[PDB]
Amino acid sequence: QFFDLTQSFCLMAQEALRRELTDNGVTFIRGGAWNGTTAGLMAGETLLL
Amino acid sequence: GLDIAGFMTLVLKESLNANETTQLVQFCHVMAQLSLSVQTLRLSEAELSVLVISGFAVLGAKNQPAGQHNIDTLFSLYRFHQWINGLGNPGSDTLDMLRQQTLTADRLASVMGLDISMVTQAMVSAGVNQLQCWQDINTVLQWIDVASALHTMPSVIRTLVNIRYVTALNKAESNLPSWDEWQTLAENMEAGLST
Amino acid sequence: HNLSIDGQPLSLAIYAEPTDPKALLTSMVQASQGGSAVLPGTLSLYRFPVMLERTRNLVAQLTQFGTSLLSMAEHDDADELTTLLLQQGMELATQSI
Amino acid sequence: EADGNTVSIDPDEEQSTFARSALMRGLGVNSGELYQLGKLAGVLDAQNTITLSVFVISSLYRLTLLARVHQLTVNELCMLYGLSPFNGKTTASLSSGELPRLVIWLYQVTQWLTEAEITTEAIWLLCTPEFSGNISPEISNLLNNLRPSISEDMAQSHNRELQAEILAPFIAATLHLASPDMARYILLWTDNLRPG
Amino acid sequence: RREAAQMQVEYQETQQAHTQAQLELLQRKFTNKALYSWMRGKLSAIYY
């Protein structure tokens, strides 16, 4: 649940950045952090990147 | 008589049905029994995921799709696990070609490390034209198991079994070999004998 | 039967000891599965640096959660192994009895 | 057996000749590995036949001899020959010095693998220019991870060593490898190879 | 005494068998080598 919450917050942050820089193409959160093979472990590091 | 969504909805229900709680405790207990089965059989992530996603179509059972909760399913699953462990490393991606219908005879023999011709003979004797399901694969396994058990060809074990020893009815028919056919069968059968 | 005067055979056989079985080896068996899908992004009300710092502390909390989870997993696993070893010891002791 | 008529060693041949059975037992080999031995010998004929000449039985017995002397099976001999420099040649078309040269080659190789404790399928995989046959889950996870992780921006560059560096992590991980520098070095090696 | 030696032989069999089974259970335990391989890979890339 916590990872879902922070994924929501990260995407909110990305959209805020997109508005600030007025360029709607820049993407960094491209999925795959919740790696189901490893119980969705260690996504915090990907989000930190 | 339940699905998972309903499982959840009546679980959030504070048990508003008197006799439904009985089947819910039974439902929980059957998950307990299935988990006990997979644990004792020591099945791992990948093959169980393959079997579940395929819905046990890649297992096959008698008169019952996917898999029921009887001894037949347990036996077949244990056999498949033993085989999948004995596969080695490449056998894992063999499961891959099992997930789709690419499971072909020559690659099967190559990964087995045995002779292709043995598998051809088992295919023609077991009557199986393609390994749709683990029914076919398991039957070919048992045919080759018999052939290697006697240290001989699958064709001649097919033929020996083919001799309906009923001798002009009381069964299908008399498959009694002719005299020379008998001699040739014996010749070939005893060929793999020591000094 | 070409024996002695008392039935002792004149020819001795061989045992023909088998090849003995083989120990099965387990391989890493893996089924490839994808990660979670991207969700659409709606828009916030704070400006960029504030959200930067708040998400920063949340992600730090999440990462320490992950590492704590892993340490739990390790301790659990070794604990299981030691219980298994004790079981094997018990049965071996019975056989030695 | 010194009669010279044609006989089929086809394992799938129905009504196998008594002479085929005699060859079976004299060679101590089953039909499948006997047919493999015929293939390796290249003395095959149409529909897996062969004349019962003295020389063919001689050569078959010789190859069986080579198999039994070095404690290896028929298929293992076939594969080691396939990797041997004398691959692509039938044992029937062997020169007078080609035989002892071959036997010393294979003795030294078998001794090497005896002292090095490596089996026959290990070496056959370790050396073959043959591939698995399909797409693997490991390469599927490679696709699921490499594709998001990196892009074409530095994939059109000319500095191969940097690209090898940046690819090294995933290769070392998915390949179950010690260090990323091992991955980088083996990538440099395989660029020295250019397999596909 | 012979029968004694036989069952100590089967005892040694028991030892070997459950050692091998212990090996398998360690192989199939949750925190296996595949986990650590994935973890190494993702950490190394993000670290770089």
Coordinates of C-alpha atoms in Angstrom, one line a residue:
Chain A
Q1 CA 0.0 0.0 0.0
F2 CA 2.8 2.4 0.9
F3 CA 4.4 1.9 -2.5
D4 CA 1.1 2.6 -4.2
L5 CA 0.9 5.9 -2.3
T6 CA 4.4 6.9 -3.2
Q7 CA 3.9 6.0 -6.8
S8 CA 0.9 8.3 -6.8
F9 CA 3.0 11.0 -5.2
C10 CA 5.8 10.6 -7.7
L11 CA 3.5 10.8 -10.7
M12 CA 1.9 13.9 -9.1
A13 CA 5.5 15.3 -8.9
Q14 CA 6.2 14.5 -12.5
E15 CA 3.1 16.3 -13.7
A16 CA 3.9 19.3 -11.6
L17 CA 7.3 19.4 -13.2
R18 CA 5.8 19.0 -16.6
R19 CA 3.6 22.1 -15.9
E20 CA 6.6 24.0 -14.5
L21 CA 8.8 23.4 -17.5
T22 CA 5.8 23.6 -19.9
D23 CA 7.0 20.6 -21.8
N24 CA 4.7 17.6 -21.7
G25 CA 7.1 15.0 -23.1
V26 CA 9.7 14.6 -20.4
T27 CA 9.0 11.3 -18.6
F28 CA 11.0 9.6 -15.9
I29 CA 8.5 7.3 -14.2
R30 CA 8.2 4.6 -16.9
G31 CA 6.9 1.8 -14.7
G32 CA 8.4 -1.5 -13.7
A33 CA 9.4 -0.5 -10.2
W34 CA 6.9 -3.0 -8.7
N35 CA 8.8 -6.1 -10.0
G36 CA 6.3 -8.8 -9.3
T37 CA 9.0 -11.6 -9.5
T38 CA 10.6 -10.2 -6.3
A39 CA 7.4 -9.4 -4.4
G40 CA 7.6 -5.9 -5.7
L41 CA 10.7 -5.3 -3.7
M42 CA 13.2 -2.4 -3.8
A43 CA 11.2 0.1 -5.8
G44 CA 12.2 2.9 -3.5
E45 CA 15.6 3.0 -5.1
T46 CA 14.2 3.3 -8.6
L47 CA 11.9 6.1 -7.4
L48 CA 14.9 7.8 -5.8
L49 CA 16.7 7.6 -9.2
Chain B
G1 CA -19.8 -22.3 -5.0
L2 CA -17.8 -19.1 -4.6
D3 CA -15.5 -16.7 -6.4
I4 CA -12.8 -14.5 -5.0
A5 CA -14.7 -11.3 -5.3
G6 CA -17.6 -12.7 -3.5
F7 CA -15.2 -14.3 -1.0
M8 CA -14.1 -10.7 -0.2
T9 CA -17.5 -9.2 -0.2
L10 CA -19.0 -11.6 2.3
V11 CA -15.7 -11.5 4.3
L12 CA -16.3 -7.8 4.8
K13 CA -19.8 -8.9 5.7
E14 CA -19.7 -9.6 9.4
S15 CA -21.0 -13.1 8.7
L16 CA -24.6 -12.1 7.8
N17 CA -25.4 -15.6 6.6
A18 CA -25.6 -18.5 9.0
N19 CA -24.8 -21.5 6.8
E20 CA -22.4 -19.6 4.4
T21 CA -19.8 -19.4 7.1
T22 CA -19.6 -23.2 7.0
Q23 CA -18.6 -23.1 3.3
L24 CA -16.3 -20.2 4.0
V25 CA -14.3 -22.1 6.6
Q26 CA -14.3 -25.0 4.2
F27 CA -13.0 -22.7 1.5
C28 CA -10.2 -21.5 3.7
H29 CA -9.4 -25.1 4.6
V30 CA -9.2 -26.1 1.0
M31 CA -6.7 -23.4 0.4
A32 CA -4.9 -24.9 3.4
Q33 CA -5.0 -28.3 1.8
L34 CA -3.8 -27.0 -1.5
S35 CA -0.9 -25.2 0.2
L36 CA -0.1 -28.4 2.1
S37 CA 0.0 -30.3 -1.2
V38 CA 2.3 -27.8 -3.0
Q39 CA 4.5 -27.7 0.1
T40 CA 4.9 -31.5 0.5
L41 CA 5.3 -31.9 -3.2
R42 CA 7.9 -29.1 -3.0
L43 CA 6.7 -27.4 -6.2
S44 CA 8.3 -24.1 -6.9
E45 CA 7.3 -20.7 -8.4
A46 CA 7.9 -21.1 -12.1
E47 CA 6.3 -24.5 -12.9
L48 CA 3.3 -23.8 -10.6
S49 CA 2.8 -20.5 -12.4
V50 CA 3.0 -22.2 -15.7
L51 CA 0.4 -24.8 -14.6
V52 CA -1.9 -22.2 -13.1
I53 CA -1.8 -19.7 -16.0
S54 CA -2.3 -22.6 -18.5
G55 CA -5.1 -23.8 -16.2
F56 CA -3.5 -27.3 -16.1
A57 CA -4.2 -27.7 -19.8
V58 CA -0.5 -28.6 -20.0
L59 CA -1.2 -31.4 -17.5
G60 CA -4.3 -33.1 -18.7
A61 CA -6.5 -35.4 -16.6
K62 CA -9.1 -38.1 -17.0
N63 CA -12.7 -37.1 -17.6
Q64 CA -12.0 -33.8 -15.7
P65 CA -10.6 -30.5 -17.1
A66 CA -7.8 -28.6 -15.5
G67 CA -7.4 -30.5 -12.3
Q68 CA -9.7 -31.8 -9.6
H69 CA -8.9 -32.7 -6.0
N70 CA -8.4 -36.4 -6.2
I71 CA -5.5 -38.9 -6.2
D72 CA -5.0 -38.7 -10.0
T73 CA -4.2 -35.0 -9.9
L74 CA -1.8 -35.5 -7.0
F75 CA 0.0 -38.4 -8.7
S76 CA 0.3 -36.6 -12.1
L77 CA 1.6 -33.4 -10.4
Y78 CA 4.2 -35.3 -8.5
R79 CA 5.4 -37.1 -11.7
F80 CA 5.6 -33.8 -13.5
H81 CA 7.6 -32.2 -10.7
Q82 CA 10.0 -35.1 -10.6
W83 CA 10.5 -34.9 -14.3
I84 CA 10.8 -31.1 -14.3
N85 CA 13.5 -31.4 -11.6
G86 CA 15.3 -34.1 -13.6
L87 CA 15.2 -31.9 -16.6
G88 CA 18.3 -30.0 -15.5
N89 CA 18.9 -26.3 -16.3
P90 CA 17.7 -26.1 -19.9
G91 CA 14.6 -28.0 -19.0
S92 CA 13.3 -24.8 -17.4
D93 CA 13.0 -23.1 -20.8
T94 CA 11.6 -26.4 -21.9
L95 CA 8.7 -25.4 -19.7
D96 CA 8.8 -22.3 -21.8
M97 CA 8.2 -24.2 -25.0
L98 CA 5.6 -26.2 -23.0
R99 CA 3.7 -23.0 -22.3
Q100 CA 3.0 -22.6 -26.0
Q101 CA 2.5 -25.6 -28.3
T102 CA 6.1 -25.7 -29.6
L103 CA 7.0 -28.9 -27.7
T104 CA 8.5 -30.9 -30.6
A105 CA 9.9 -34.4 -30.7
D106 CA 13.5 -33.8 -31.9
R107 CA 14.1 -30.9 -29.4
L108 CA 12.5 -33.1 -26.8
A109 CA 15.0 -36.0 -27.4
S110 CA 17.9 -33.6 -27.7
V111 CA 17.1 -32.1 -24.2
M112 CA 16.5 -35.6 -22.9
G113 CA 20.0 -36.6 -24.3
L114 CA 18.5 -39.9 -25.7
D115 CA 18.1 -41.1 -29.3
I116 CA 15.6 -39.4 -31.6
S117 CA 14.5 -42.7 -33.1
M118 CA 13.4 -44.0 -29.8
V119 CA 11.1 -41.0 -29.4
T120 CA 9.8 -41.5 -33.0
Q121 CA 9.0 -45.1 -32.1
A122 CA 7.3 -44.2 -28.9
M123 CA 5.2 -41.6 -30.8
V124 CA 4.1 -44.1 -33.3
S125 CA 3.4 -46.8 -30.6
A126 CA 1.7 -44.6 -28.0
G127 CA -0.4 -43.3 -30.9
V128 CA 0.4 -39.7 -30.0
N129 CA 1.1 -37.3 -32.9
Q130 CA 1.9 -34.1 -30.9
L131 CA 2.5 -33.3 -27.2
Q132 CA -0.6 -31.2 -26.7
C133 CA -0.6 -32.0 -22.9
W134 CA 1.3 -33.8 -20.2
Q135 CA -0.9 -36.8 -20.9
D136 CA 1.0 -37.3 -24.1
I137 CA 4.4 -36.5 -22.6
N138 CA 3.8 -38.8 -19.6
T139 CA 2.7 -41.6 -21.8
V140 CA 5.8 -41.3 -24.0
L141 CA 7.8 -41.2 -20.8
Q142 CA 6.2 -44.5 -19.7
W143 CA 6.7 -46.1 -23.1
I144 CA 10.4 -45.2 -23.2
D145 CA 10.7 -46.2 -19.6
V146 CA 9.5 -49.7 -20.5
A147 CA 11.8 -49.8 -23.6
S148 CA 14.9 -48.8 -21.5
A149 CA 13.8 -51.1 -18.7
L150 CA 14.1 -54.1 -21.1
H151 CA 17.1 -52.5 -22.8
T152 CA 15.3 -52.8 -26.2
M153 CA 13.4 -50.9 -28.8
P154 CA 9.9 -49.4 -28.3
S155 CA 8.6 -51.1 -31.5
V156 CA 9.1 -54.6 -30.2
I157 CA 7.6 -53.8 -26.9
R158 CA 4.6 -52.4 -28.8
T159 CA 4.5 -55.6 -30.8
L160 CA 4.7 -57.9 -27.7
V161 CA 1.9 -55.9 -26.1
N162 CA 0.1 -56.1 -29.5
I163 CA -0.2 -59.8 -29.2
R164 CA -3.7 -60.2 -27.9
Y165 CA -3.3 -63.6 -26.4
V166 CA -7.0 -64.6 -26.8
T167 CA -6.4 -66.9 -29.8
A168 CA -9.5 -66.5 -32.0
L169 CA -11.9 -64.5 -29.8
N170 CA -13.1 -64.1 -26.2
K171 CA -11.4 -60.7 -26.8
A172 CA -10.8 -58.4 -29.7
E173 CA -9.1 -61.0 -32.0
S174 CA -6.0 -63.3 -32.3
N175 CA -2.9 -61.2 -32.9
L176 CA -0.8 -64.4 -32.8
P177 CA 2.3 -63.9 -34.9
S178 CA 3.2 -66.3 -37.7
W179 CA 6.0 -68.7 -37.3
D180 CA 8.6 -66.6 -39.0
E181 CA 7.2 -63.5 -37.3
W182 CA 7.6 -65.2 -34.0
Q183 CA 11.2 -66.1 -34.8
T184 CA 12.0 -62.6 -35.9
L185 CA 10.4 -61.1 -32.8
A186 CA 12.5 -63.4 -30.6
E187 CA 15.7 -62.7 -32.6
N188 CA 15.3 -59.0 -32.1
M189 CA 14.2 -59.2 -28.5
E190 CA 17.2 -61.3 -27.4
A191 CA 19.6 -59.2 -29.4
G192 CA 20.5 -57.0 -26.4
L193 CA 21.8 -59.9 -24.3
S194 CA 25.3 -60.3 -22.8
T195 CA 27.7 -63.2 -23.2
Chain C
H1 CA 24.4 -82.1 -12.2
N2 CA 28.2 -82.4 -12.1
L3 CA 28.4 -81.8 -8.3
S4 CA 30.5 -83.2 -5.6
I5 CA 29.6 -86.4 -3.8
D6 CA 27.6 -84.3 -1.4
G7 CA 25.9 -81.7 -3.7
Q8 CA 28.6 -79.1 -3.7
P9 CA 28.6 -77.2 -7.0
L10 CA 31.8 -77.1 -9.1
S11 CA 31.1 -73.6 -10.6
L12 CA 30.7 -70.2 -8.9
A13 CA 28.6 -67.3 -10.2
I14 CA 29.0 -63.6 -10.1
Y15 CA 27.0 -60.9 -8.3
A16 CA 26.8 -58.4 -11.2
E17 CA 26.5 -55.3 -9.0
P18 CA 24.5 -52.5 -10.5
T19 CA 25.6 -49.0 -11.6
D20 CA 23.8 -47.5 -8.5
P21 CA 21.4 -44.5 -8.7
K22 CA 22.2 -40.8 -9.4
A23 CA 21.6 -37.8 -7.2
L24 CA 19.1 -35.4 -8.7
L25 CA 20.3 -31.7 -8.9
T26 CA 17.9 -28.8 -8.8
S27 CA 18.3 -25.8 -11.2
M28 CA 17.2 -22.2 -10.9
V29 CA 13.8 -22.4 -12.5
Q30 CA 12.3 -18.9 -13.2
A31 CA 9.1 -17.7 -14.8
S32 CA 9.5 -14.2 -16.3
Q33 CA 6.8 -11.7 -15.2
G34 CA 6.3 -8.1 -15.8
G35 CA 6.2 -5.1 -13.5
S36 CA 3.3 -2.9 -12.7
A37 CA 1.8 -0.6 -15.3
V38 CA 2.1 3.2 -15.4
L39 CA -0.9 5.1 -14.0
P40 CA -2.0 8.4 -15.5
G41 CA -0.6 11.5 -13.8
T42 CA -2.9 14.2 -12.4
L43 CA -1.8 17.6 -11.2
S44 CA -1.0 18.8 -7.7
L45 CA -1.2 22.2 -5.9
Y46 CA 2.2 22.7 -4.3
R47 CA 5.2 23.8 -6.3
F48 CA 8.1 21.6 -7.3
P49 CA 10.7 21.9 -4.4
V50 CA 8.2 21.2 -1.6
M51 CA 6.9 18.1 -3.3
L52 CA 10.6 17.1 -3.9
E53 CA 11.4 17.1 -0.2
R54 CA 8.2 15.4 1.0
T55 CA 8.5 12.6 -1.5
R56 CA 12.1 12.4 -0.5
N57 CA 11.4 11.6 3.1
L58 CA 8.6 9.2 2.1
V59 CA 10.9 7.3 -0.3
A60 CA 13.5 7.1 2.4
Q61 CA 10.9 5.6 4.8
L62 CA 10.0 3.1 2.1
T63 CA 13.6 2.1 1.4
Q64 CA 14.3 1.5 5.1
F65 CA 11.1 -0.6 5.1
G66 CA 12.5 -2.7 2.3
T67 CA 15.9 -3.3 4.0
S68 CA 14.1 -4.2 7.3
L69 CA 11.9 -6.7 5.3
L70 CA 15.0 -8.3 3.9
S71 CA 16.6 -8.8 7.3
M72 CA 13.4 -10.3 8.6
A73 CA 13.5 -12.7 5.6
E74 CA 17.1 -13.8 6.2
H75 CA 16.5 -14.5 9.9
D76 CA 13.3 -16.4 9.1
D77 CA 15.1 -18.5 6.5
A78 CA 18.1 -19.5 8.7
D79 CA 15.7 -20.3 11.5
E80 CA 13.8 -22.7 9.3
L81 CA 17.0 -24.3 8.2
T82 CA 18.1 -24.9 11.8
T83 CA 14.7 -26.5 12.7
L84 CA 15.1 -28.8 9.7
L85 CA 18.6 -29.7 10.8
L86 CA 17.3 -30.6 14.3
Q87 CA 14.7 -32.9 12.8
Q88 CA 17.3 -34.7 10.7
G89 CA 19.4 -35.1 13.9
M90 CA 16.5 -36.6 15.7
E91 CA 15.9 -39.3 13.2
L92 CA 19.6 -40.1 12.8
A93 CA 19.8 -40.4 16.6
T94 CA 16.9 -42.9 16.5
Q95 CA 18.8 -45.0 13.9
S96 CA 21.9 -44.9 16.0
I97 CA 19.9 -46.1 19.0
Chain D
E1 CA 28.3 -62.0 -41.9
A2 CA 31.1 -62.3 -44.5
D3 CA 28.4 -62.6 -47.2
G4 CA 28.3 -59.1 -48.6
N5 CA 24.5 -58.7 -49.1
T6 CA 22.8 -55.4 -48.3
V7 CA 21.1 -55.1 -44.9
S8 CA 19.3 -52.1 -43.4
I9 CA 20.4 -50.9 -40.0
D10 CA 17.3 -48.7 -39.9
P11 CA 16.1 -48.9 -36.3
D12 CA 12.6 -48.1 -37.7
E13 CA 13.0 -51.0 -40.2
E14 CA 10.2 -53.5 -39.6
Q15 CA 11.4 -57.1 -40.0
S16 CA 15.0 -56.5 -39.0
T17 CA 17.4 -59.0 -40.5
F18 CA 19.0 -61.8 -38.5
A19 CA 22.3 -60.3 -39.6
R20 CA 21.3 -56.9 -38.2
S21 CA 20.6 -58.7 -34.9
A22 CA 24.0 -60.4 -35.0
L23 CA 25.7 -57.0 -35.6
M24 CA 23.6 -55.7 -32.7
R25 CA 24.9 -58.2 -30.2
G26 CA 28.5 -58.4 -31.5
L27 CA 28.9 -54.7 -31.2
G28 CA 27.3 -54.5 -27.7
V29 CA 25.2 -51.5 -28.9
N30 CA 21.5 -50.9 -29.3
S31 CA 20.0 -50.1 -32.6
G32 CA 19.8 -46.3 -32.1
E33 CA 23.4 -45.8 -31.2
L34 CA 24.3 -48.3 -34.0
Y35 CA 22.5 -46.1 -36.5
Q36 CA 24.2 -43.1 -34.9
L37 CA 27.5 -45.0 -35.5
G38 CA 26.6 -45.6 -39.1
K39 CA 25.9 -41.9 -39.5
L40 CA 29.3 -41.0 -37.9
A41 CA 31.0 -43.6 -40.1
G42 CA 29.4 -42.3 -43.2
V43 CA 29.2 -45.8 -44.6
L44 CA 25.4 -45.3 -44.6
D45 CA 23.3 -45.9 -47.7
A46 CA 19.7 -45.2 -48.7
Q47 CA 17.0 -46.1 -46.2
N48 CA 19.8 -46.7 -43.7
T49 CA 21.3 -49.7 -45.4
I50 CA 24.9 -51.1 -45.6
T51 CA 26.7 -53.9 -47.4
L52 CA 27.9 -56.8 -45.1
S53 CA 31.5 -56.3 -46.3
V54 CA 34.4 -57.0 -43.9
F55 CA 35.5 -53.4 -44.0
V56 CA 32.3 -51.9 -42.7
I57 CA 32.1 -54.3 -39.8
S58 CA 35.8 -53.6 -39.2
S59 CA 35.3 -49.8 -39.1
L60 CA 32.2 -50.1 -36.9
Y61 CA 34.1 -52.3 -34.5
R62 CA 37.0 -49.8 -34.5
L63 CA 34.8 -46.9 -33.6
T64 CA 33.1 -49.0 -30.9
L65 CA 36.6 -49.8 -29.7
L66 CA 37.5 -46.1 -29.5
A67 CA 34.3 -45.4 -27.5
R68 CA 34.9 -48.2 -25.0
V69 CA 38.6 -47.5 -24.5
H70 CA 38.2 -43.9 -23.3
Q71 CA 35.2 -44.6 -21.1
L72 CA 32.7 -42.7 -23.2
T73 CA 29.4 -43.5 -24.9
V74 CA 28.6 -43.5 -28.7
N75 CA 26.9 -40.1 -28.6
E76 CA 29.7 -38.6 -26.6
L77 CA 32.2 -39.8 -29.2
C78 CA 30.0 -38.4 -31.9
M79 CA 29.9 -35.0 -30.2
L80 CA 33.6 -34.9 -29.4
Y81 CA 34.3 -35.7 -33.1
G82 CA 32.0 -32.9 -34.1
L83 CA 34.1 -30.5 -32.1
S84 CA 37.3 -32.3 -33.1
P85 CA 39.3 -30.7 -35.9
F86 CA 38.7 -33.9 -37.9
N87 CA 35.0 -33.1 -37.9
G88 CA 33.4 -33.0 -41.3
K89 CA 35.2 -36.2 -42.4
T90 CA 34.0 -39.8 -42.3
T91 CA 36.1 -42.2 -40.4
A92 CA 36.0 -44.4 -43.5
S93 CA 37.8 -41.6 -45.4
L94 CA 40.8 -41.5 -42.9
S95 CA 44.4 -41.4 -44.0
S96 CA 46.9 -43.8 -42.5
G97 CA 48.4 -41.2 -40.3
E98 CA 45.0 -39.6 -39.7
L99 CA 44.1 -42.5 -37.4
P100 CA 46.9 -42.4 -34.9
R101 CA 46.8 -38.6 -35.0
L102 CA 43.1 -38.7 -34.2
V103 CA 43.5 -41.3 -31.4
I104 CA 46.3 -39.3 -29.6
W105 CA 44.2 -36.2 -30.0
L106 CA 41.2 -37.9 -28.4
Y107 CA 43.3 -39.6 -25.6
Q108 CA 44.8 -36.2 -24.7
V109 CA 41.4 -34.6 -24.7
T110 CA 39.8 -37.3 -22.6
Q111 CA 42.7 -37.1 -20.1
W112 CA 42.3 -33.3 -20.1
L113 CA 38.6 -33.6 -19.2
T114 CA 39.3 -36.4 -16.7
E115 CA 41.8 -34.2 -14.8
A116 CA 39.5 -31.2 -15.3
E117 CA 36.3 -32.9 -14.2
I118 CA 34.0 -31.7 -16.9
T119 CA 31.3 -34.0 -18.4
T120 CA 30.5 -34.5 -22.1
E121 CA 27.3 -32.5 -22.4
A122 CA 28.9 -29.7 -20.5
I123 CA 31.7 -29.5 -23.1
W124 CA 29.3 -30.0 -26.0
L125 CA 27.3 -27.0 -24.8
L126 CA 30.5 -25.2 -23.9
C127 CA 31.8 -25.4 -27.5
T128 CA 28.9 -25.8 -29.9
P129 CA 27.9 -23.2 -32.5
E130 CA 24.3 -24.4 -31.9
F131 CA 21.6 -22.5 -30.1
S132 CA 18.8 -23.5 -27.8
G133 CA 15.9 -23.4 -30.3
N134 CA 13.6 -20.7 -29.1
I135 CA 13.3 -17.5 -26.9
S136 CA 14.1 -18.0 -23.2
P137 CA 12.4 -16.4 -20.1
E138 CA 15.9 -15.1 -19.0
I139 CA 16.2 -13.1 -22.3
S140 CA 12.5 -12.1 -21.7
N141 CA 13.4 -10.5 -18.4
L142 CA 16.5 -9.1 -20.1
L143 CA 14.0 -7.4 -22.5
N144 CA 11.8 -6.3 -19.6
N145 CA 14.8 -4.6 -17.8
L146 CA 17.3 -3.5 -20.5
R147 CA 14.7 -1.7 -22.6
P148 CA 13.4 0.7 -19.9
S149 CA 16.9 1.0 -18.3
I150 CA 18.8 2.4 -21.4
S151 CA 17.9 4.0 -24.6
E152 CA 19.2 4.7 -28.1
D153 CA 20.8 8.0 -27.1
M154 CA 24.2 6.4 -26.4
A155 CA 23.5 3.4 -28.6
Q156 CA 24.6 5.2 -31.7
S157 CA 27.9 6.1 -30.2
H158 CA 31.3 4.9 -31.4
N159 CA 33.0 4.2 -28.0
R160 CA 32.4 0.5 -27.7
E161 CA 34.1 0.2 -24.3
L162 CA 31.6 2.6 -22.6
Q163 CA 28.7 0.8 -24.1
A164 CA 30.1 -2.5 -22.8
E165 CA 30.6 -0.8 -19.4
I166 CA 26.9 0.3 -19.2
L167 CA 25.7 -3.1 -20.4
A168 CA 27.9 -5.0 -17.9
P169 CA 25.6 -4.8 -14.9
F170 CA 22.6 -6.6 -16.4
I171 CA 24.8 -9.2 -18.1
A172 CA 26.6 -9.9 -14.9
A173 CA 23.4 -10.2 -12.9
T174 CA 21.3 -12.2 -15.3
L175 CA 24.3 -14.3 -16.1
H176 CA 25.0 -15.0 -12.4
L177 CA 28.5 -13.5 -12.6
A178 CA 31.0 -12.3 -10.0
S179 CA 31.8 -8.7 -10.9
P180 CA 30.6 -6.1 -13.5
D181 CA 34.2 -6.0 -14.8
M182 CA 33.9 -9.7 -15.7
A183 CA 30.8 -8.8 -17.7
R184 CA 32.5 -5.9 -19.4
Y185 CA 35.5 -8.1 -20.3
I186 CA 33.4 -10.9 -21.6
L187 CA 31.5 -8.4 -23.7
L188 CA 34.7 -7.2 -25.2
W189 CA 35.5 -10.9 -25.9
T190 CA 32.3 -11.5 -27.7
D191 CA 32.7 -8.4 -29.8
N192 CA 36.0 -9.9 -30.7
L193 CA 33.9 -12.9 -31.7
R194 CA 30.9 -11.4 -33.4
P195 CA 28.8 -14.6 -33.2
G196 CA 25.6 -13.7 -35.0
Chain E
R1 CA 26.8 -58.7 13.2
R2 CA 26.3 -58.8 9.4
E3 CA 22.8 -57.6 9.7
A4 CA 24.2 -54.8 11.9
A5 CA 26.6 -53.7 9.2
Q6 CA 23.7 -53.7 6.7
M7 CA 21.6 -51.3 8.6
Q8 CA 24.4 -49.0 9.3
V9 CA 24.9 -48.9 5.6
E10 CA 21.2 -47.9 5.2
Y11 CA 21.8 -45.4 7.9
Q12 CA 24.5 -43.8 5.8
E13 CA 22.0 -43.8 3.0
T14 CA 19.6 -41.9 5.2
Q15 CA 22.3 -39.4 6.0
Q16 CA 23.1 -38.8 2.3
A17 CA 19.5 -38.7 1.2
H18 CA 18.4 -36.0 3.7
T19 CA 21.6 -34.0 3.1
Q20 CA 20.6 -33.9 -0.5
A21 CA 17.0 -33.0 0.4
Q22 CA 18.4 -30.2 2.6
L23 CA 20.3 -29.0 -0.4
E24 CA 17.1 -28.9 -2.5
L25 CA 15.2 -27.1 0.3
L26 CA 18.0 -24.5 0.5
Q27 CA 17.9 -24.2 -3.3
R28 CA 14.1 -23.5 -3.3
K29 CA 14.1 -21.2 -0.3
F30 CA 12.7 -17.8 -0.9
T31 CA 15.9 -15.8 -0.8
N32 CA 17.6 -17.7 -3.5
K33 CA 20.4 -16.8 -6.0
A34 CA 17.9 -15.4 -8.6
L35 CA 16.7 -12.8 -6.0
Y36 CA 20.3 -11.7 -5.3
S37 CA 21.1 -11.6 -9.0
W38 CA 18.2 -9.3 -9.7
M39 CA 19.1 -7.2 -6.7
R40 CA 22.7 -6.9 -7.8
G41 CA 21.7 -6.0 -11.3
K42 CA 19.2 -3.2 -10.4
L43 CA 21.4 -1.8 -7.7
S44 CA 24.5 -1.7 -9.9
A45 CA 22.7 0.1 -12.7
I46 CA 21.0 2.6 -10.5
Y47 CA 24.2 3.1 -8.6
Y48 CA 26.2 3.9 -11.8

